[PDB]
Design a protein around this ligand. Sequence first.
Ligand SMILES: *[C@@H]1O[C@H](CO)[C@@H](O[C@@H]2O[C@H](CO)[C@@H](O[C@@H]3O[C@H](CO[C@H]4O[C@H](CO[C@H]5O[C@H](CO)[C@@H](O)[C@H](O)[C@@H]5O[C@H]5O[C@H](CO)[C@@H](O)[C@H](O)[C@@H]5O)[C@@H](O)[C@H](O[C@H]5O[C@H](CO)[C@@H](O)[C@H](O)[C@@H]5O[C@H]5O[C@H](CO)[C@@H](O)[C@H](O)[C@@H]5O)[C@@H]4O)[C@@H](O)[C@H](O[C@H]4O[C@H](CO)[C@@H](O)[C@H](O)[C@@H]4O[C@H]4O[C@H](CO)[C@@H](O)[C@H](O)[C@@H]4O[C@H]4O[C@H](CO)[C@@H](O)[C@H](O)[C@@H]4O)[C@@H]3O)[C@H](O)[C@H]2NC(C)=O)[C@H](O)[C@H]1NC(C)=O
Ligand SMILES: *[C@@H]1O[C@H](CO)[C@@H](O[C@@H]2O[C@H](CO)[C@@H](O[C@@H]3O[C@H](CO[C@H]4O[C@H](CO)[C@@H](O)[C@H](O)[C@@H]4O)[C@@H](O)[C@H](O[C@H]4O[C@H](CO)[C@@H](O)[C@H](O)[C@@H]4O)[C@@H]3O)[C@H](O)[C@H]2NC(C)=O)[C@H](O)[C@H]1NC(C)=O
Ligand SMILES: *[C@@H]1O[C@H](CO)[C@@H](O[C@@H]2O[C@H](CO)[C@@H](O[C@@H]3O[C@H](CO)[C@@H](O)[C@H](O[C@H]4O[C@H](CO)[C@@H](O)[C@H](O)[C@@H]4O)[C@@H]3O)[C@H](O)[C@H]2NC(C)=O)[C@H](O)[C@H]1NC(C)=O
Ligand SMILES: *[C@@H]1O[C@H](CO)[C@@H](O[C@@H]2O[C@H](CO)[C@@H](O[C@@H]3O[C@H](CO)[C@@H](O)[C@H](O)[C@@H]3O)[C@H](O)[C@H]2NC(C)=O)[C@H](O)[C@H]1NC(C)=O
Ligand SMILES: *[C@@H]1O[C@H](CO)[C@@H](O[C@@H]2O[C@H](CO)[C@@H](O)[C@H](O)[C@H]2NC(C)=O)[C@H](O)[C@H]1NC(C)=O
Ligand SMILES: *[C@@H]1O[C@H](CO)[C@@H](O[C@@H]2O[C@H](CO)[C@@H](O)[C@H](O)[C@H]2NC(C)=O)[C@H](O)[C@H]1NC(C)=O
Ligand code: NAG
Ligand code: NAG
Lengths: 245, 392
Amino acid sequence: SDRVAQLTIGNSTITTQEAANIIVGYGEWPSYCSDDDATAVDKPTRPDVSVNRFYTLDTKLWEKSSKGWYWKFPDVLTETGVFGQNAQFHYLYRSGFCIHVQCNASKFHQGALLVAILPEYVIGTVAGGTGTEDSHPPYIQTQPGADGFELQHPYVLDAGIPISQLTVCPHQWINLRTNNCATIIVPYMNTLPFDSALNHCNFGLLVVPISPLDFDQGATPVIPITITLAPMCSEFAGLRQAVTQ
Amino acid sequence: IEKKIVLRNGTEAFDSWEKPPLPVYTQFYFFNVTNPEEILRGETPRVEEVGPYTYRELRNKANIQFGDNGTTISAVSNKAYVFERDQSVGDPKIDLIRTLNIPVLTVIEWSQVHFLREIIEAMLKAYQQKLFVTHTVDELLWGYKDEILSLIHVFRPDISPYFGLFYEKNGTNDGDYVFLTGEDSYLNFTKIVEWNGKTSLDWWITDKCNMINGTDGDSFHPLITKDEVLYVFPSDFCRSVYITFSDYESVQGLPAFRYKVPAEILANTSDNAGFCIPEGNCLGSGVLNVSICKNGAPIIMSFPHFYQADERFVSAIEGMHPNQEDHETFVDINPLTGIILKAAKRFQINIYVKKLDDFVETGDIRTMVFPVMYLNESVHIDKETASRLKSM
Ligand SMILES: *[C@@H]1O[C@H](CO)[C@@H](O[C@@H]2O[C@H](CO)[C@@H](O[C@@H]3O[C@H](CO[C@H]4O[C@H](CO[C@H]5O[C@H](CO)[C@@H](O)[C@H](O)[C@@H]5O[C@H]5O[C@H](CO)[C@@H](O)[C@H](O)[C@@H]5O)[C@@H](O)[C@H](O[C@H]5O[C@H](CO)[C@@H](O)[C@H](O)[C@@H]5O[C@H]5O[C@H](CO)[C@@H](O)[C@H](O)[C@@H]5O)[C@@H]4O)[C@@H](O)[C@H](O[C@H]4O[C@H](CO)[C@@H](O)[C@H](O)[C@@H]4O[C@H]4O[C@H](CO)[C@@H](O)[C@H](O)[C@@H]4O[C@H]4O[C@H](CO)[C@@H](O)[C@H](O)[C@@H]4O)[C@@H]3O)[C@H](O)[C@H]2NC(C)=O)[C@H](O)[C@H]1NC(C)=O
Ligand SMILES: *[C@@H]1O[C@H](CO)[C@@H](O[C@@H]2O[C@H](CO)[C@@H](O[C@@H]3O[C@H](CO[C@H]4O[C@H](CO)[C@@H](O)[C@H](O)[C@@H]4O)[C@@H](O)[C@H](O[C@H]4O[C@H](CO)[C@@H](O)[C@H](O)[C@@H]4O)[C@@H]3O)[C@H](O)[C@H]2NC(C)=O)[C@H](O)[C@H]1NC(C)=O
Ligand SMILES: *[C@@H]1O[C@H](CO)[C@@H](O[C@@H]2O[C@H](CO)[C@@H](O[C@@H]3O[C@H](CO)[C@@H](O)[C@H](O[C@H]4O[C@H](CO)[C@@H](O)[C@H](O)[C@@H]4O)[C@@H]3O)[C@H](O)[C@H]2NC(C)=O)[C@H](O)[C@H]1NC(C)=O
Ligand SMILES: *[C@@H]1O[C@H](CO)[C@@H](O[C@@H]2O[C@H](CO)[C@@H](O[C@@H]3O[C@H](CO)[C@@H](O)[C@H](O)[C@@H]3O)[C@H](O)[C@H]2NC(C)=O)[C@H](O)[C@H]1NC(C)=O
Ligand SMILES: *[C@@H]1O[C@H](CO)[C@@H](O[C@@H]2O[C@H](CO)[C@@H](O)[C@H](O)[C@H]2NC(C)=O)[C@H](O)[C@H]1NC(C)=O
Ligand SMILES: *[C@@H]1O[C@H](CO)[C@@H](O[C@@H]2O[C@H](CO)[C@@H](O)[C@H](O)[C@H]2NC(C)=O)[C@H](O)[C@H]1NC(C)=O
Ligand SMILES: *[C@@H]1O[C@H](CO)[C@@H](O)[C@H](O)[C@H]1NC(C)=O
Ligand SMILES: *[C@@H]1O[C@H](CO)[C@@H](O)[C@H](O)[C@H]1NC(C)=O
């Protein structure tokens, strides 16, 4: 009654029969902006079906020597579907997300992942190596899009913060002896109630193998990791022509 | 006894070798791509030989140290280039040269050896680039800030974001050389014996292929015969070459044995089978993979215009017309004194291209060898100093 689930929203459902449990980030569901909070005076659009779908984005192969990946949300979906068309026309934006990452393996493979969220995941550099040149990260390390980006130094998460206490932020583990998926429901976290969808990326989805993959030779050596996400309770405002960046 | 030509502090042969008094003239020739999009569609390329770009060189020696009771000498050989304008067609800092983009073909190579694979494959995908770019002459040859190489520098701080064909070669050395002067024997005079502490090369297949022979090519040993074989190791070609006898020449008023770089340096022989890396599968005759000794750059060293090379590469590029007189490598040596009279070092820098489906900037390009640039480095002895050597 906990191992088996089904998440239907929009026209797309996903079934899982070896889940762990759904955690709701910071204990509350995504919701619409109340009139106590809103400052924009134009009526928002709320598509309510066409953008609240599980978008399956990409597939990272996980071998025995991987480091970890990250996806900046919502810039994984400003190139995809009716979410990517409404977020490019409209200046303002708010939504929550239901984030579901699948990674199946046999009952002989082993290894654990820490799929975790963290809001305002800013990216530092190696500062020129020795630490004296103020190098800023490029635009693709900042906002990789639906392609994702691989961590260089996952012990410090490319930001000088340790991964050992990433477990404070909303997370759950995918260890291949127990579960194969990890649902994380995230509300809209930001100070101001709407923001731009092209500039500001509210959070980043860190997916790091902490305990590495291991399997005896003869088993299937290709163990993919696919993340599917669904913008919940999304609404846009401030209509103008299409910007792409 | 001609012991007058030695490298002793107190001799006039050491004065010519420490400071070469005769200028060296190098003319940089380029290839301009006329149909760049049609190569991406898969058509036959059409180029244009563009020049001349006359540089006058500067030469000296630094860090000269002796040893083993005077017979072993070790110094560096700096080389600074100064452009000459009246002997060139136009101002190089305006002259736009359209060719391949060598840094974005370098970092595709790095993805093939899994050297920063997912970092570089994120660069060329989100930042769409051009296989064919157009920069000036001084940018393409003396450093220019690349887009993608400026992004690798913040991930890896060792990578220089400035690419150039001869980048950081103005006033810098090409190794810590050590030589063998003629205090013991006049057969081995200023011969390269070791390189940066290492005895010989280390990246070739066999230990016969690794052996560094001969000199750097500045001045040779005297008493040259017609039947002996001289060996030259330039630091650009990354092996030791030899030179064969050509004909009788006449430099001003002195004897000359014209020696030329033969076709059997880069031919398809059983000796040159071991210079194709890794397993002897050669791209063709007359070409050489030198991608190891340029820090991973897909460069091919060959004669200009595929001279003494395969014909199926000549017919692949419209404009390749090699001949004997204009695109060879030769040297005029005084047979009595070993002073180089008139030389011309002509070598072509090519960039290998092939259609790879994971990089959608290559279009539909054929697997071939593409012309980029070549240069005639010429040295010449004038009228007054020729008459100084007519006495001896
Ligand atoms: C001129 O000259 C120049 C110079 O030389 C040149 O260059 C060149 O090039 C070429 C071409 O490209 C090259 O080759 C290549 O290479 C490559 C690479 O390799 C490298 O790398 C690797 C990687 O690794 C990774 O992974 C692993 C697993 O796999 C792991 O373990 C590790 O750790 C790593 O990881 C990393 O990374 C990743 C990525 O992804 C990430 O993710 C992570 O994170 C991390 O970081 C490596 O490994 C290698 O290594 C090597 O070496 C060493 C030394 O030190 C050793 O120790 C080792 O062991 C190794 O060795 C081995 O291996 C190799 C392979 O690899 C071999 O070869 C050898 O022999 C031995 O055995 C390196 O470093 C590669 O890949 C390739 O290979 C391929 O190909 C071939 C032919 O071609 C074949 O034979 C093979 O087999 C392969 O195939 C494969 O692959 C493909 C693609 O990918 C596919 O498609 C197919 O299908 C296949 O697959 C299959 O099979 C397999 C088996 O193998 C299996 O598994 C699967 O499943 C399937 O079934 C090639 O080889 C080279 O390299 C270069 N060079 C150099 C020096 O390098 C040029 O070219 C010239 N030019 C002209 C014109 O020619
Ligand atoms: C460094 O190396 C470069 C080349 O790598 C040398 O530059 C070449 O020098 C030669 C000789 O000075 C030049 O050749 C000359 O070209 C003239 C024009 O040629 C064009 O037109 C003819 C038709 O007339 C075409 O067939 C040809 O393809 C060219 O498009 C010729 O008129 C000259 O002919 C003279 O010599 C021949 C030799 O047989 C005689 O028969 C003639 O009667 C006449 O006297 C001559 O062939 C060549 O153009 C130069 N190339 C470039 C790109 O400049 C450098 O000289 C060399 N050294 C230095 C210091 O840089
Ligand atoms: C190698 O080949 C390439 C293309 O095959 C060639 O590049 C082109 O050269 C032309 C001529 O220099 C460039 O055209 C110029 O562009 C500037 C910038 O806008 C214009 O201001 C220029 O206008 C002048 O045009 C006349 C002179 O040509 C004058 O009468 C007029 O009043 C203007 O002053 C001119 O159009 C062109 O931009 C490049 N193209 C690219 C993509 O770089 C290159 O020149 C060739 N190199 C050599 C050495 O031959
Ligand atoms: C550097 O110089 C050395 C010595 O001068 C070269 O080694 C020699 O290379 C020649 C190549 O012609 C070898 O000759 C061969 O002889 C056999 C018969 O023995 C003949 O059948 C072959 O056709 C070939 O001519 C010679 O054996 C070899 N000697 C040694 C000790 O290796 C070397 O090749 C030069 N390397 C470079 C990069 O210049
Ligand atoms: C390479 O460096 C040399 C050494 O400075 C440069 O040559 C001098 O440049 C100065 C700059 O004003 C000028 O006085 C002359 O052009 C040169 N002087 C002498 C005495 O040679 C040269 O410009 C540099 N070349 C490149 C391509 O970088
Ligand atoms: C360079 O020489 C080698 C050695 O003969 C050639 O390799 C042979 O090529 C023929 C075809 O011409 C094949 O039938 C043989 O089986 C090959 N033998 C070996 C041992 O590889 C090579 O093809 C020549 N290069 C070129 C471009 O023709
Ligand atoms: C050459 O000249 C004299 C000879 O003793 C010496 O003082 C000088 O230092 C020598 N130069 C070098 C570079 O060794
Ligand atoms: C050079 O001089 C003679 C002639 O070959 C020889 O005895 C000597 O060992 C040679 N030295 C080197 C380093 O080649």
